[PDB]
Amino acid sequence: CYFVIILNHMTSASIITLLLPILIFLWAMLSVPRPSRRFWMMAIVYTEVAIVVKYFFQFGNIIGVEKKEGYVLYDLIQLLALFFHRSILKCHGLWDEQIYVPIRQFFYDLIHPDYSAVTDVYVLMFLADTVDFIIIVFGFWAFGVPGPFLVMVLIQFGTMVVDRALYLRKTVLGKVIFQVILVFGIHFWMFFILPGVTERKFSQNLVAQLWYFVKCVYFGLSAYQIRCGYPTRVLGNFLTKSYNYVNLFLFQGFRLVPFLTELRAVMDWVWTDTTLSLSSWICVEDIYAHIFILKCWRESEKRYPQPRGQKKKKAVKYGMGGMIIVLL
Amino acid sequence: SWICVEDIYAHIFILKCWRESEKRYPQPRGQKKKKAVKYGMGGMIIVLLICIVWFPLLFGVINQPLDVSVTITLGGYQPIFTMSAQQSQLKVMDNSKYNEFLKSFGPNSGAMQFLENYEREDVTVAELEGNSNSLWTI
Amino acid sequence: ICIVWFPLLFGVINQPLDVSVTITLGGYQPIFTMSAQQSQLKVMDNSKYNEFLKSFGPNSGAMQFLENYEREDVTVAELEGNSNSLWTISPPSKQKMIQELTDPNSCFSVVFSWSIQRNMTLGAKAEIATDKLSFPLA
Amino acid sequence: DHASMVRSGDYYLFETDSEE
Amino acid sequence: DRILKLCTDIFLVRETGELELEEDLYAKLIFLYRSPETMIKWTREKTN
Amino acid sequence: KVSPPSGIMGLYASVVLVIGKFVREFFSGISHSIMFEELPNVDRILKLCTDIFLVRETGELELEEDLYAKLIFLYRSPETMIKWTREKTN
Amino acid sequence: KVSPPSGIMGLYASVVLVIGKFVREFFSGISHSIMFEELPNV
């Protein structure tokens, strides 16, 4: 039902199909055990009212509240999925169980829970963000030298940086505050500013649709991370614990990015309780990286030994030589 | 040898300066690195990098036609018709008449938004009265 | 100095062969057109060029403007009397003109223009140099 | 002192003990 | 293995927050890389 | 509506890659230059360099050669440089 | 008097700065490579 609502919104840029996913990302994915029946009932009656209202205006705008043509297919699928979920919740025992006080209590128990099932999903968040970055940079060739994509990639870089910052300090209140800001920012900027300036209708820009979809995926991952909590060990590198060809090659590929490794080291140093200058930090990181690569090569040459100075196999020699030749 | 000596002397002098500095402003032990200097250096590196990579990616008046002219000709002979107009038969569309223009294309399917890019000034009309000005002297 | 400096390392007189002037009224056939070639084109006599030079004696600050030239890159073009071509607008166009002149509401334009055809075995940037001025009338 | 102790290395750190 | 051990201990101590041990271990590592002979003596094959 | 009057992408990309390669020098080859940075009490080497300069100023070139040989041998062996740049605490 | 027929500044500045950086290598990192140069009886 989450995916069908997100798709209904990606196919229609109205304001009601915009009001609903905000409640999805701020109320559904933040309840502790599971979303309450109140939210499901509200979503059901909201889809009902939307279907009714979109029907009346077939007799007789600038924002694109409705087109008044074609089908209401997506609303039908949305309602059917909501009722399906309600029915299979009632099949189990999950169903059936002035305004500042409830929100205060809710956010308080979310920030200070009785128990926290701590887990780390930060790597998935960063993978979603870097896929979004690949999309936003390859959009240069097709959609918003242009103007809007500049500030778009700028705020993307900024949100990635501040997200890593929030992750290092293992803060939760900061994470929920950042989620609340970022959801409103992204939605308003994507459905009230982008479709107007140097842009056709949003329902025809596929790149923006994929960007929005992966950003909703990132929003869901961040909401999950908030719901569970943060562990106590968030310092070790992501892929330095196997000593294998996969680790070695992925680590080399990670180091091949021009402005990523040193930026990573600086960002780790600036938000970590340490007592070393920046130069000492850089020296330690350099030493650790080289020693790790050497350890990987040592383990490799241990696992696949060669007896003595017989030869170097003609296959690998020819391969490397031809590779260097074709590269040159 | 001269270059080696100068290099050694420069590096040793810089190291001596840093030693004297860390002697004059000591810090007790591994308490912390003050958040102020850490934030300062981090933000400085960040703004330097974004200025290096981003700033290279940084980078109307209405008019009216003074003369209009039309020429119709047959094959490769002298033109049979030629006519020009200037500032008198050039009508700027009256605002009310411009509104009747706007709604005149009501039953049109998808050419109204094409003209909605303009205003009542960048669209004018040119009248060409009757006969041809020049003769026909083949 | 070769690495930094060498990257920082990096006229024939002509006379116009054809001259032409065209005066016209608004958007009608030109009332006057006249061209001259190599006969009514006078190169200024050296003595007459001296009387030219001292003719601008009482001038304040336009003499040094012409001191950039010589007695060869400055010539004159004579245009004798009548217009070469006829004036062959249609009689109804005559009526249109005469009746568009009487109305004191709108204006009427008189525009003069000149062209210089200059090119030979010697090649220039542009073979033709043309420019025109426009005026209303009382 | 921070700077005094951060550079207090000597041979006796790397002894052949390896006390396992 | 010993240098990787030392770096991992540095990282773990930095994670915990006992910065004195961090300073001691960083001094040890700096002195290790500040003399090749003790690095040879410290990275022997350890065959038994 | 006429507006008044108002390749390089390749050069931009190239200079960005070159600047990235240059920045990498501050993070990939630092462990190599540790024998010449973490030095306490560099007073003796500075003394030796100042004596070299003073002897060169005077004109007694034999002492200049001797002191230059001493400095070269100092930088030609890390262990004697450690022994020579001790903290000298008393 | 017509005369007969007869961006890059950025490339010039860039290549000059790069050549300066390359020249600096002959003066800033020489003390490091002393253990491998001053060798008698090789």
PDB file of C-alpha atoms in Angstrom, chain A residues 133 135-141 143-159 189 194 197-198 211, chain B residues 50-59, chain F residues 9 12:
ATOM      1  CA  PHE A 133      23.278  11.556  -6.958  1.00  0.00           C
ATOM      2  CA  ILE A 135      20.517  10.173 -11.276  1.00  0.00           C
ATOM      3  CA  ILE A 136      20.725  13.895 -10.505  1.00  0.00           C
ATOM      4  CA  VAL A 137      24.062  14.258 -12.303  1.00  0.00           C
ATOM      5  CA  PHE A 138      23.037  12.262 -15.376  1.00  0.00           C
ATOM      6  CA  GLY A 139      19.883  14.381 -15.529  1.00  0.00           C
ATOM      7  CA  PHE A 140      22.178  17.176 -16.729  1.00  0.00           C
ATOM      8  CA  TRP A 141      21.977  15.678 -20.220  1.00  0.00           C
ATOM      9  CA  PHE A 143      16.357  17.773 -17.676  1.00  0.00           C
ATOM     10  CA  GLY A 144      16.858  20.174 -14.774  1.00  0.00           C
ATOM     11  CA  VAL A 145      24.645  24.917 -17.859  1.00  0.00           C
ATOM     12  CA  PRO A 146      20.990  24.691 -16.701  1.00  0.00           C
ATOM     13  CA  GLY A 147      19.866  26.516 -13.593  1.00  0.00           C
ATOM     14  CA  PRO A 148      17.745  24.287 -11.346  1.00  0.00           C
ATOM     15  CA  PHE A 149      19.957  21.195 -11.418  1.00  0.00           C
ATOM     16  CA  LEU A 150      22.778  23.287  -9.938  1.00  0.00           C
ATOM     17  CA  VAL A 151      20.953  24.044  -6.687  1.00  0.00           C
ATOM     18  CA  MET A 152      19.485  20.532  -6.891  1.00  0.00           C
ATOM     19  CA  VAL A 153      22.879  18.808  -6.758  1.00  0.00           C
ATOM     20  CA  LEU A 154      24.050  21.419  -4.241  1.00  0.00           C
ATOM     21  CA  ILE A 155      21.293  20.551  -1.779  1.00  0.00           C
ATOM     22  CA  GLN A 156      21.895  16.859  -2.508  1.00  0.00           C
ATOM     23  CA  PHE A 157      25.550  17.185  -1.508  1.00  0.00           C
ATOM     24  CA  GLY A 158      24.525  19.219   1.530  1.00  0.00           C
ATOM     25  CA  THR A 159      21.960  16.678   2.698  1.00  0.00           C
ATOM     26  CA  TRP A 189      10.510  22.029  -4.062  1.00  0.00           C
ATOM     27  CA  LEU A 194      10.385  22.495 -10.291  1.00  0.00           C
ATOM     28  CA  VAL A 197      10.600  26.859 -14.038  1.00  0.00           C
ATOM     29  CA  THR A 198      12.176  25.600 -17.299  1.00  0.00           C
ATOM     30  CA  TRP A 211      14.663  10.769  -8.364  1.00  0.00           C
TER      31      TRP A 211
ATOM     32  CA  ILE B  50      32.797  23.498  -3.154  1.00  0.00           C
ATOM     33  CA  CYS B  51      34.260  26.729  -4.547  1.00  0.00           C
ATOM     34  CA  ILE B  52      36.767  24.738  -6.600  1.00  0.00           C
ATOM     35  CA  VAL B  53      34.141  22.369  -8.014  1.00  0.00           C
ATOM     36  CA  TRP B  54      30.976  24.502  -8.163  1.00  0.00           C
ATOM     37  CA  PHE B  55      31.587  28.160  -9.058  1.00  0.00           C
ATOM     38  CA  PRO B  56      32.852  27.205 -12.560  1.00  0.00           C
ATOM     39  CA  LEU B  57      29.284  25.888 -13.015  1.00  0.00           C
ATOM     40  CA  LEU B  58      27.739  29.322 -12.402  1.00  0.00           C
ATOM     41  CA  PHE B  59      27.948  30.347 -16.065  1.00  0.00           C
TER      42      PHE B  59
ATOM     43  CA  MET F   9      33.676  21.901 -20.355  1.00  0.00           C
ATOM     44  CA  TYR F  12      37.028  22.304 -16.737  1.00  0.00           C
TER      45      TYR F  12
END
